[PDB]
Amino acid sequence: QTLRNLLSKVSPSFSAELKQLNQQYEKLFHKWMLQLHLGFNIVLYGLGSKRDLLERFRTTMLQDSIHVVINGFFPGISVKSVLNSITEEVLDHMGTFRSILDQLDWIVNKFKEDSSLELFLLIHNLDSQMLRGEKSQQIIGQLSSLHNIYLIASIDHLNAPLMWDHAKQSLFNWLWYETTTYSPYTEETSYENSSSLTHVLRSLTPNARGIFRLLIKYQLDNGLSFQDFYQQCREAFLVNSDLTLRAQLTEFRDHKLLLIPVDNGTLTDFLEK
Amino acid sequence: GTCYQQAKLVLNTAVPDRLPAREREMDVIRNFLREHICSLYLSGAPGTGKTACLSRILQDLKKELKGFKTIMLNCMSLRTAQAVFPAIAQEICDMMRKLEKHMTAEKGPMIVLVLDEMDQLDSKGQDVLYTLFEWPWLSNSHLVLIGIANTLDLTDRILPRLQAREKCKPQLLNFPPYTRNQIVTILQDRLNQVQFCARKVSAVSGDVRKALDVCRRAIEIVESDVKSLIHISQVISEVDSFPLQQKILVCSLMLLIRQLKIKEVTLGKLYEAYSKVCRKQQVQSECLSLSGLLEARGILGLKRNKETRLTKVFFKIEEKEIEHALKDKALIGNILA
Amino acid sequence: TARTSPVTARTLETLIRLATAHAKARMSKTVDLQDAEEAVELVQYAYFKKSESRLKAFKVALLDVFREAHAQSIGMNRLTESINRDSEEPFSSVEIQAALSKMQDDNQVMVSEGIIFL
């Protein structure tokens, strides 16, 4: 999958229609801002990567106000991290919190006491694996229930409507907009995690390399019993005592290398290489 | 007598003034550092002297070049991975922001940070390593970071994202194990006032420290004999009477594994077989104690399942070696018959 | 290649009979080599349808010697006697030493002062 890094040389097709499509999409920003500012939260749904449109909207209209961007497609994001970021910067508070619910209570009380605070949220790929928790969406909806917070979200998964319940629907107060941009999902697939054997075996002792080669050969022929494997290793004179063979087996185990959990085709290609 | 003492002293594990047979790696490191003074990852097997050679070359660069600050840190001295953040700051003078602001300064001497045994800096999310590797590629960065590791998969398991972004790939250098000729050259360099030991060390592990220990032990045995090939092989074979009840127990267990063919035998059946054999030759706490004692010698292995009956027993020695360890065939025949 | 018919004792009878027929083809009295060769070629066509041994013997003998001793050191007299006793051919010393040198380059066998160690 390393070849992916070199695959970016392919040129796009029919880019003129995409240009007109983006120009048509650009004109809805004022209406979206008006709908946000009256107490509505907006979801964007449609085919194609819509990150570019959101970034354009931010850099065009949100350069004069406080705004927080969370690109949830990163698999390391959690709601507690968002809460900590809000507390540390929006309110500039450093004190730790005993529980998530207590942090939510503090934030709600602070925002209710201070009516001069306005915050904008820009969430990318709200359907992330880490944000699908019921408590996560409950927390986000409770946050969005305030009249001093504006929410723009994006949907890219098919089963998104199952996330929201009737009470959650009432809390979120959603409006929908269809914006299909046809953009490739380069960045959003970049962080996602869908050679090693050669590098490991390069610096290992040649006896271990031969033993592993024999093990691969037997595995491709048809798991070995310990006794038969020891006898065959004896026959090749790569082992002088069973303690040494078990030491080599433990060395292989330490690298997570009896069955080898490696695909047959990869082993066949590696043997000749 | 002083000759033996001097030979033992020279062959110690202390870092020497010169490390021969590693001139290629040392030259590569020197060229890299001189290019980056006017991100490196060393990976190697234990006993390759990576720490020693890096310390020697860093001392040489300190002697020859000026205008840089070099900071050593050992990861084992830190109980927590996150504790790497203060330990670095204490060596230069929210804390990570202070480190970044001190590192991105427009004017400032170059900083060469080396963290020995990088593999100990693992995290539940690998965040610390990611930040450390992304530091040298920020704006106005003056960082040359060197990471020493024994694990070969740190650049593979831990850093897929650095492979995703081409600009953040460090330069990797691997230390091959010492060959027989290299070991012989090092040994003759130590004694300016052999082949068999070097061959065995290279074939087993290639660890120069192991060869030094072997020759030290050989010198110790030679000097002990005087005060009162053969020595080297003797020591290496050394490193590389049983109670009668224990003999009866192990013979009974061998009979059981031959008879019922199972790999592991329950303690109750083993005790029953032991009692039957004792009745044949007219000879449970004692049995369990003997099993534990046998496990102490390393003859038998016990999978302990928190109960007397659930503790399972297995062998560790080939049958032929077991038979030849016995010096009497009369007992063997009597137990077999 | 697979076989169309099983090979039994009757195949030898068939070979003899085909040789006799081919000898009958040309006026003669005796059976010649090509007479049997023609029948053999016919049988080959009809029936079927679509050093190193030195090294192997040396290794087998070494295995037998070393785990008939159950020790890592073996006396030279017993070595030679057992190697040249169970083998039909007492092997040449020069080629034995060449094999020993090749295995030494393989780091499998070391000979020192007439004693062999693995």
Coordinates of C-alpha atoms in Angstrom, one line a residue, chain A residues 69-175:
Chain A
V69 CA -12.8 23.1 13.9
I70 CA -12.9 19.4 14.7
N71 CA -11.9 17.0 11.9
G72 CA -13.4 13.9 13.5
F73 CA -12.0 11.6 10.7
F74 CA -8.8 11.4 12.7
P75 CA -9.2 8.1 14.6
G76 CA -7.6 9.6 17.8
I77 CA -10.4 12.2 18.5
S78 CA -12.7 11.8 21.5
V79 CA -15.4 14.0 22.9
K80 CA -13.4 14.5 26.1
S81 CA -10.6 16.0 24.0
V82 CA -13.1 18.5 22.5
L83 CA -14.3 19.4 25.9
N84 CA -10.8 19.9 27.2
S85 CA -9.9 22.1 24.2
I86 CA -13.0 24.2 24.7
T87 CA -12.3 24.7 28.5
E88 CA -8.6 25.5 27.9
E89 CA -9.0 28.0 25.2
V90 CA -12.6 29.4 24.9
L91 CA -12.8 29.9 28.7
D92 CA -9.0 29.8 29.3
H93 CA -9.5 27.4 32.2
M94 CA -6.7 25.0 33.3
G95 CA -8.3 23.2 36.3
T96 CA -9.0 19.5 35.7
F97 CA -12.4 18.0 35.9
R98 CA -13.5 15.0 38.0
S99 CA -16.0 13.7 35.3
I100 CA -17.3 14.5 31.8
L101 CA -20.7 15.3 33.2
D102 CA -19.3 17.8 35.7
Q103 CA -17.3 19.5 32.9
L104 CA -20.6 19.7 30.8
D105 CA -22.3 21.2 33.9
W106 CA -19.6 23.8 34.3
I107 CA -19.6 24.7 30.6
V108 CA -23.4 25.1 30.6
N109 CA -23.5 27.2 33.7
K110 CA -20.7 29.4 32.4
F111 CA -22.3 30.0 29.1
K112 CA -25.7 30.6 30.7
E113 CA -24.1 33.2 33.1
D114 CA -22.2 34.9 30.3
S115 CA -24.5 35.8 27.4
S116 CA -21.7 37.6 25.5
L117 CA -20.0 34.4 24.4
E118 CA -20.7 33.1 20.8
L119 CA -19.0 30.0 19.4
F120 CA -19.0 28.3 16.0
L121 CA -18.5 24.6 15.4
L122 CA -17.1 23.1 12.2
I123 CA -17.1 19.3 12.4
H124 CA -15.8 17.2 9.6
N125 CA -17.1 13.6 9.2
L126 CA -19.5 13.5 12.2
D127 CA -20.0 9.8 11.4
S128 CA -16.6 8.8 12.6
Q129 CA -16.1 5.5 14.5
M130 CA -15.0 7.4 17.6
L131 CA -18.0 9.8 17.6
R132 CA -20.7 7.1 17.1
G133 CA -21.2 6.6 20.8
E134 CA -24.7 7.4 22.1
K135 CA -23.2 9.5 25.0
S136 CA -21.0 11.3 22.5
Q137 CA -24.0 12.5 20.4
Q138 CA -26.0 13.2 23.6
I139 CA -23.2 15.5 24.8
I140 CA -22.9 17.2 21.4
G141 CA -26.7 17.7 21.3
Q142 CA -26.8 19.1 24.8
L143 CA -24.0 21.5 23.7
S144 CA -25.9 22.6 20.6
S145 CA -29.2 23.1 22.6
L146 CA -27.7 26.5 23.7
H147 CA -28.7 29.6 21.7
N148 CA -25.1 30.9 21.8
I149 CA -23.6 28.0 19.8
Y150 CA -23.9 27.4 16.0
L151 CA -23.3 24.0 14.5
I152 CA -22.3 22.9 11.0
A153 CA -21.9 19.2 10.5
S154 CA -21.2 16.8 7.6
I155 CA -22.4 13.3 6.8
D156 CA -20.6 10.8 4.7
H157 CA -21.9 7.5 6.0
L158 CA -25.1 5.8 4.7
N159 CA -26.7 4.8 8.1
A160 CA -26.4 8.3 9.6
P161 CA -30.1 8.9 10.3
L162 CA -30.1 6.0 12.8
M163 CA -27.9 8.1 15.1
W164 CA -30.6 10.6 16.0
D165 CA -33.6 9.9 18.1
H166 CA -36.8 12.0 18.5
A167 CA -35.5 13.8 21.6
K168 CA -32.1 14.2 19.9
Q169 CA -33.9 15.5 16.8
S170 CA -35.7 18.1 18.9
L171 CA -32.4 19.1 20.7
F172 CA -30.4 19.4 17.5
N173 CA -33.0 21.3 15.4
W174 CA -31.6 20.1 12.1
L175 CA -31.9 21.6 8.6

